[PDB]
Amino acid sequence: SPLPVLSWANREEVWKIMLNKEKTYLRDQHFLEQHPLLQPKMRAILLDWLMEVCEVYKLHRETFYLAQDFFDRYMATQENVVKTLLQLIGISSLFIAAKLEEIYPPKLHQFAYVTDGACSGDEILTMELMIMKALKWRLSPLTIVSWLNVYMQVAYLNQYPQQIFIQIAELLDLCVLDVDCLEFPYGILAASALYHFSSSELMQKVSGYQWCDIENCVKWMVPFAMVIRETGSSKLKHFRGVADEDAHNIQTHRDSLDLLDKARAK
Amino acid sequence: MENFQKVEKIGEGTYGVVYKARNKLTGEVVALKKIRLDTETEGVPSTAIREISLLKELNHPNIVKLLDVIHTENKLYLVFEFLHQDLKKFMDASALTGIPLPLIKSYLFQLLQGLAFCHSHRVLHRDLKPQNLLINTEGAIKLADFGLARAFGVPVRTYTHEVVTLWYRAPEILLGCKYYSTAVDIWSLGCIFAEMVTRRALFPGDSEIDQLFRIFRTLGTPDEVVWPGVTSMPDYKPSFPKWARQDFSKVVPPLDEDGRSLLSQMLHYDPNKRISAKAALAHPFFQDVTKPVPHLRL
Ligand SMILES: CCNS(=O)(=O)N1CC[C@H](Nc2nc(N[C@@H](CC)[C@@H](C)O)nc3c2ncn3CC)C1
Q: Phosphoserine (modified residue): where (chain A)?
């Protein structure tokens, strides 16, 4: 329990509830073994594409991570999915996420518009219902990015600086494109990314996780952190109509595909 | 959807219509929220997706139980437990006789328990008003209508749209605060608590300024001492009349010293000083209802 004595509720009670959510929400790193026609590089191209349409429509990082988790968890319930069906499932996962997270989310015709005609409004309204029903209406998970936000709030309550947040988010966006990340809990993934930009001491102070808890994850993360380090981390951008205090919360897009190639090589 | 027989219409919202129903086979009396999908150009309404999802997570005896979700031909049905009456109807029925203090106390403690659970799950109700609080015949009360409930972590922003009935809206919101906090729900419950004691709305304004002026008339016009930062707020005006705080004997006469205490802590101007739902449960006003637990010093 790294959260300080919370005024609203018990510091440990809030923390334990967050941990019990990860125990109920399940993800599988081998879900593509149920869809033999699909390869792990297909999921990577899809999430990279969703990341770009998020940046285009200035959508929140939480919106992207909701769509990622909806897509990954939905496919774990499905079988023998075809390459052509993936664009619709991803954009419908994003449609649900935008409606849940954004205040004035993009309209259905804009979600159909980004698919260059390969998806229509009726296909997306049919697909969102299949997704929500298959997920048993459990659409309130703790995303990979939500943990990062909690970790930043803890480190500065003892609001936070934006530049550091986007650098750690940039590394998590790369790691999310590899389906093997789904073997490590979302909280572990975030603490491990934060450790690569800080230390074990700060990671334990804001996440409560000991070194043994995140050691396995930090080992797998190591190649991705190097590619991010080799090139230098990005700077905070300004977004029109977006209040500067919330600018770190807007989803961004990079040439992460070739960065993911170099990472798996080493 | 064939196993249900509609008994009667209960109410209607932007989202959908509520009915009392019988599961003809079982005899289970439920509340059905019907949502026509053919009417919405954006599929399942954002608000309906959020309410279904939030209510699956929020399992607490003082929160309405969502029993099932059924998808029919361009219709989405939310099946909930049925409760015979809301707090607004109950308070109007009890306007002459009064509500017995042990029942006021029992209801307030139960409301605070359900609210603490929402807050511990990082959820802001945002619309706590008597008609959204459902009671049963055996003394229970539950929070309901989570259509406007938003989760925090990255605090919920404020906007110019149909939110919490003005009467239960916190003063930081009226004064232009850009972010909601758990303190806005505690403010609503203090208003509801006072309303159970007097059997009339504590602050029944007709505009945002009338609401604010009514709050200032009863609690006194605030300053930097009572509320650090109030004068530097977006909708604050130095021109506001300076009224003095009224004695809580003239605001809530039937309430005791313990009761008057809890109400002042619930209606504190400062969102940072205003009592929490967890802290309110520990207050000496409920000492007869609850028995304290040993705290682990570790
Ligand atoms: C409006 C009439 N009030 S009354 O006359 O005091 N009274 C008759 C029965 C009614 N019960 C329920 N009312 C509502 N009302 C909803 C808004 C019309 C909102 C609060 O969920 N939702 C319920 C009820 N049972 C279960 N759910 C969950 C869907 C209370």
A: 1
Residues of A in contact with B42 (CB under 8 A): 99, 107-108
Measured between its terminal Cα atoms, the distance across chain A in Å is: 35
Binding residues of B: 10-18, 33, 81-83, 86, 129-132, 145
What single-letter DSSP state applies at residue B115? H
Specify whether the CB–CB gap between A237 and A202 falls below 8 A: no
What are all long-range contacts of B212-221, with beta carbons under 8 Å and residues at least 24 apart? B212/B171, B212/B174, B212/B175, B212/B240, B213/B240, B213/B241, B215/B171, B215/B174, B216/B240, B216/B241, B216/B243, B217/B243, B217/B246, B218/B245, B218/B246, B218/B251, B219/B245, B219/B246, B219/B267, B219/B269, B220/B244, B220/B245, B220/B246
Q: Could you give the 3-state DSSP secondary structure of residue B26? A: coil
Q: Which of residues 118-147 of A touch B (CB under 8 A)?
A: 124-125, 128-129, 132-133, 136-140, 146
Task: Give the domain extent around B118.
Answer: 85-296
Counting every residue written for chain A, the total comes to: 266
Residue type, A91: I
B144: amino acid identity, one letter: A
* Way it was determined: X-ray
Q: Which atom of ligand 1 is nearest to the CA of B133?
A: 20
Q: Residue A266 is encoded by which pair of tokens?
A: 């080493």
On whether both B229 and B267 belong to a single domain, the answer is: yes
A205-213's contacts with Cβ under 8 Å and 24+ in sequence apart are: A205/A2, A205/A154, A205/A155, A205/A158, A206/A2, A206/A151, A206/A152, A206/A154, A206/A155, A207/A2, A207/A147, A207/A151, A207/A154, A208/A1, A208/A2, A208/A15, A213/A188
C-alpha A68/C-alpha A150 separation (Å) is: 19
Residue of B nearest to A125 (CA): B43
CATH topology classification for A144-265: Cyclin A; domain 1 (1.10.472)
Q: Which CATH superfamily is domain A25-134 in?
A: Cyclin-like (1.10.472.10)
Instruction: Tell me whether residue B127 is one of the annotated catalytic residues.
Output: yes
Following DSSP, what letter does each residue of A57-83 receive, concatenated?
Answer: TT-BHHHHHHHHHHHHHHHTT--S--G
How many domains does chain B divide into? 2
Q: What are the residue ranges spanned by the domains of chain A?
A: 25-134, 144-265
Longest CA span, chain A: 52
Amino acid present at A3: L
**In A, which residues are within 8 Å of B57 by CB distance?**
21, 138, 140
Using the mean position of ligand 1's atoms as its centre, give its distance from the Cα of residue B89 in Å: 10
DSSP 8-state assignment for residue B108: H
SS3 B66: strand
Contact A219, A227 (CB under 8 A): no
Contact B80, B64 (CB under 8 A): yes
Torsion of CA B279, B284, B286, B290, to 10 degrees: 80
Q: Which are the contacts of B283, defined by CB distance < 8 A and separation ≥ 6?
A: B258, B261, B262, B265, B275
Pair type for strands B85-86 and B150-151: unpaired
Residue B46: closest CA among chain A residues belongs to which residue? A99
CA angle A77, B15, B208 (to 5 degrees): 125
